[PDB]
Every structure is written in C-alpha cells, then in structure tokens.
Design a binder for this molecule. Sequence first.
Ligand SMILES: Cc1ccc(N2C(=O)C(O)=C(C(=O)c3ccccc3)[C@@H]2c2cc(Br)cs2)cc1C(=O)O
Length: 123
Amino acid sequence: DISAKDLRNIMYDHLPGFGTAFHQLVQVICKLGKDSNSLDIIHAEFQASLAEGDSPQCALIQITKRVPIFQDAAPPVIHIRSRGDIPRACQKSLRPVPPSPKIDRGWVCVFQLQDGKTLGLKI
Ligand SMILES: Cc1ccc(N2C(=O)C(O)=C(C(=O)c3ccccc3)[C@@H]2c2cc(Br)cs2)cc1C(=O)O
C-alpha cells in the first residue's frame, strides 16, 4: 500500500525544478489524500493522466478536478513563521488571499505567517 511519502516521491520524480508551486501542490494532495484515505485513487488518476500523454503538471491539476475530496474545496491553511519558510521557486506565486479561494481553481494552500500575514499560493 502506497504511503504519503511514497506518493510524494513518485510525483516529485516527474516534476522539473524544485520547490515550485507544483511541488507544494503535491504536498497538499498527499496530506489531504492521506487524511481522507484516498492515496490509492489519487495515485491511479495521476498514472492514468500520464499514460494518456498529459504533462505531470496537468495530471496534478486534473486530480484537483476529478478526485471528489478536492472538488469545490477550500485550500488547507499551513502555519509558518515567515516568508522565508516558503521555497524560493514558490515566492512569485504567492498572492493576497481572495475571499473564497478553491483548490480546484488553482489555490493550492494558504500560508498563515506568525505575525498574522496571510498569503495564498496560486497556480
Ligand atoms: C501526509 C503529510 C503530507 C505532507 C505533510 N507536510 C509536511 O510535513 C510539510 O512540511 C508540509 C508542507 O507543505 C510545508 C510547506 C512549507 C512550510 C511548511 C510546511 C506538508 C504539509 C501539507 C499540508 Br496541507 C499541511 S503540512 C505532512 C503530512 C503528515 O502526515 O504530517
């Protein structure tokens, strides 16, 4: 049975660069997937999408649209100390949080900084 660490590694092995917004999306898909016992269907959708010729980036997005735990779901909140805890390759993807962010519309997560600042990571 696939673990969350295993799934993260499989997905990472298909992504170019490191610490990009897509890497963070893998983290969120894996966390939310573990918590909803859905790692197997997520892995299956990921592989099916690649097998059809989709880019791995499109495969990750398709998961947010096809797997029901992500459908019309709010992005998870992740508490951090400062913007420095976010990878360099994510920095330009950080945005002010809109009123009703949804994962399946590209809002991967919401970082909540110690001093109260809040930033959404957008794909
Ligand atoms: C199954 C799983 C997947 C990923 C993680 N994460 C980590 O251990 C971790 O460090 C995660 C991050 O994405 C992260 C990114 C930047 C700064 C801090 C955390 C990341 C998180 C995803 C979400 Br949604 C909340 S934390 C944790 C778990 C877990 O079981 O604790």
